[PDB]
Amino acid sequence: MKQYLELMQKVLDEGTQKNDRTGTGTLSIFGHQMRFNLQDGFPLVTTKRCHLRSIIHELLWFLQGDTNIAYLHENNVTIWDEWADENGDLGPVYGKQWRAWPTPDGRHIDQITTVLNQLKNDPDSRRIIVSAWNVGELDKMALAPCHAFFQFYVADGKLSCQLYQRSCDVFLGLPFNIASYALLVHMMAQQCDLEVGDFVWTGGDTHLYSNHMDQTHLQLSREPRPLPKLIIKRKPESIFDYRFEDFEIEGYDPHPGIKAPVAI
Amino acid sequence: MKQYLELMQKVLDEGTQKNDRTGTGTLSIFGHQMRFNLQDGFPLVTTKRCHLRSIIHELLWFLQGDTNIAYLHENNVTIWDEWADENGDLGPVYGKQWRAWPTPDGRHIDQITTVLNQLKNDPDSRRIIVSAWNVGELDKMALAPCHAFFQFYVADGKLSCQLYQRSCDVFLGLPFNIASYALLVHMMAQQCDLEVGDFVWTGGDTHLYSNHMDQTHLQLSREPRPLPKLIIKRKPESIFDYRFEDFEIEGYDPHPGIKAPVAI
Ligand SMILES: *C1=[C@@]2(F[C]2N2[C]([C][N]C3=[C][C]=C(C(=O)[N][C]([C][C]C([O])=O)C([O])=O)[C]=[C]3)[C][N]C3=C2C(=O)[N]C([N])=N3)C(=O)[N]C(=O)N1[C]1[C][C]([O])[C]([C]OP([O])([O])=O)O1
Ligand SMILES: *C1=[C@@]2(F[C]2N2[C]([C][N]C3=[C][C]=C(C(=O)[N][C]([C][C]C([O])=O)C([O])=O)[C]=[C]3)[C][N]C3=C2C(=O)[N]C([N])=N3)C(=O)[N]C(=O)N1[C]1[C][C]([O])[C]([C]OP([O])([O])=O)O1
């Protein structure tokens, strides 16, 4: 998509060489922001084929409050396999944090429910936020949250969401984080009788792994096609009730996929 | 500063009318990002004289993990007066979450110490963060962190910082926020022998309260001046050792101050 492709070119033009945890080495920039008007089309990358199945399944898994890959397996999604223990566990990652952030006083807060309630009774609130960034549990997580905190906003009968992504693998993670947050907005928007507004993505260390440079230049040589269109076929009783099947992406015609290795 | 006045103009030209919590009404935009090269001078508004002493103590108050305005008082700093209790407590706000995030099990994690250790031992790290957004203790705070979450980055011996500000008062709060974090980059940069890099500011709900329309217009017509320069007179032995006397500004020739009511 135009915005995505401009971020890539930005990394290349202004990125500095950095060593990283995975010992692979990156090209990184610090602080970026791009806006996607969800009414223009569904933000699914077209200059490379993306695997929607994996995208959706992962989010349904987040919303369930699950942190074990079994679910992901039953559905043939193996994007998290490498961080998973012998038992399929990832520790208190996203889904636990979103649905049951543990408080110091033996309580547990469901952040999605909270947000949902806020978008309905006090949408002018400047406190409509979900944080995966739970400092008391980071040491028990397979990996610390990449997409760590988000905030909603309603104005003119449109829901907007802004994401603060602390670390971003531009080639592999980014296309995934974008289509995912966008589908979240559409889902929230349906539950609250809002129209879709903007998805604004903000980044922390945004980088290209040193082993994704050729694939990067290949992609860039491609011209984006018209964005797909999301069609939700049902209105479940709760946000927690979507099924893989309620969702339909129309008009998706991307360039051929490009393989690249994930740094572990 | 040019970045600042442009944002002030943007709220006016595009903000949508919102009924806020204070009941004042505000002009609002969702999502904005500005960057400040700390190398080019300290980001202290010059189109209105800023109260540097309030900015400094507030900060030093934070680093101590103090949640009591007592200390703010002794230094004749009244900015947190209206939200404190009869005892002068605000609850586990900023100071408490920076210096002692209460874990579920009874421990406490010192996020500041952690960040120092990370900058000294693992600068390339992508998890260098401090969060004041402790979901479990939000109901205990007088008000929720406006400056929620921030993250440090190191590239080429330079230390950069990025702040996620969920709610922002362009007129009163903003200038205070920008110079407060800048000041921090500076004390961080020095205790860790790095050069200063960029200060990236990202906001959620960014607004101008409707009773600041005048002051805003008054301010929108002055020519920004050159930015001052920060001098750290001494190298304390630890970052919890700064003092007011240690900081000096130079070349701060501001336009005259502007008085404005605070929305409570
Ligand atoms: C981070 C995050 F959280 C991500 N991630 C994870 C996992 N996930 C995934 C994986 C893989 C993939 C793929 O491969 N894709 C492909 C295929 C599809 C199918 O097959 O289905 C395409 O697309 O083509 C996907 C997904 C964990 N880990 C990791 C990740 C990434 O991404 N990368 C890496 N290297 N690793 C998010 O969300 N995002 C992002 O971006 N991230 C990242 C950032 C960095 O780089 C990392 C982390 O680390 P630190 O250190 O920073 O912490 O990652
Ligand atoms: C939020 C925050 F946390 C701010 N803030 C606070 C306090 N601080 C302050 C106050 C006041 C001031 C003034 O006035 N200043 C002046 C003077 C100085 C002397 O005198 O000393 C000038 O500057 O001139 C300052 C400071 C708390 N509260 C509040 C505040 C503000 O600002 N505003 C209001 N209204 N209140 C931060 O940090 N930031 C921000 O921005 N904030 C804000 C945002 C909003 O608006 C609010 C909150 O609400 P929600 O709903 O969102 O939560 O705030």
From Swiss-Prot, chains A, B:
The active site is at residue 146. DUMP binds at residues 21, 126-127, 166-169, 177, 207-209. GO terms for biological process: dTMP biosynthetic process; dTTP biosynthetic process; methylation. It is found in: Cytoplasm. Its main location: cytoplasm. Keywords: Cytoplasm, Formylation, Methyltransferase, Nucleotide biosynthesis, Transferase. One of its GO terms (molecular function) is thymidylate synthase activity. It catalyses: dUMP + (6R)-5,10-methylene-5,6,7,8-tetrahydrofolate = 7,8-dihydrofolate + dTMP. Belongs to the thymidylate synthase family. Bacterial-type ThyA subfamily. NCBIfam families: PRK01827.1-3, PRK01827.1-5, thym_sym. Catalyzes the reductive methylation of 2'-deoxyuridine-5'-monophosphate (dUMP) to 2'-deoxythymidine-5'-monophosphate (dTMP) while utilizing 5,10-methylenetetrahydrofolate (mTHF) as the methyl donor and reductant in the reaction, yielding dihydrofolate (DHF) as a by-product. This enzymatic reaction provides an intracellular de novo source of dTMP, an essential precursor for DNA biosynthesis. This is Thymidylate synthase.
